[PDB]
């Protein structure tokens, strides 16, 4: 019980809203792709830096001579190498903790 053109106007308004909200959805997906690209670049940079750093250590390698072994074994307690390995393990744990915390912080983008 309404004049002509009112249903057509309402359909046009609904169509406009649907089109605009679809555009918004597309832009949201673009932003998510941007975030993924950023995370990938960050991790790739870390991996490349690691590769370069590991390579340098091959050239300058050196070993303790046969001498000085007797004295070191004379003094070395049972918990020296375990302490050194604990320090290295702590270093690795802190590194991966920092990486994971950065990944978590990427939730704010």
């Amino acid at each position: 019980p309404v004049l002509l053109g009112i249903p057509l106007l309402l359909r046009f308004l609904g169509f406009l809203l649907v089109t605009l909200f679809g555009y918004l959805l597309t832009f949201l997906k673009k932003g998510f792709g941007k975030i993924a690209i950023a995370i990938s670049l960050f991790l790739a940079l870390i991996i490349g830096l690691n590769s370069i750093l590991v390579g340098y250590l091959s050239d300058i390698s050196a070993q303790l001579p046969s001498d000085f072994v007797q004295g070191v074994q004379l003094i070395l307690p049972s918990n020296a190498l375990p302490c050194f390995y604990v320090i290295l393990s702590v270093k690795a744990a802190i590194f991966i903790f920092d990486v994971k915390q950065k990944i978590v912080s990427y939730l704010d983008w």
């Binding site: 001498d67 004295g71 003094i75 302490c83 050194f84 320090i87």
Partner: protein, 46 residues
């Protein structure tokens, strides 16, 4: 002459002492290096 024989004997004794001292100083130097390396690690860590 007895004098030259005594001097040569003293020189040989000194050489033996020098060899033994070199061995012992190498051992003690190795111990000192080990102590400094295994304390430096933890100290520099913190």
């Amino acid at each position: 002459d007895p004098a030259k024989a005594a001097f040569n004997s003293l020189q040989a004794s000194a050489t033996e002492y020098i060899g033994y001292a070199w061995a012992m100083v190498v051992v003690i130097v190795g111990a000192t290096i080990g102590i400094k390396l295994f304390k430096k690690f933890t100290s520099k860590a913190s």
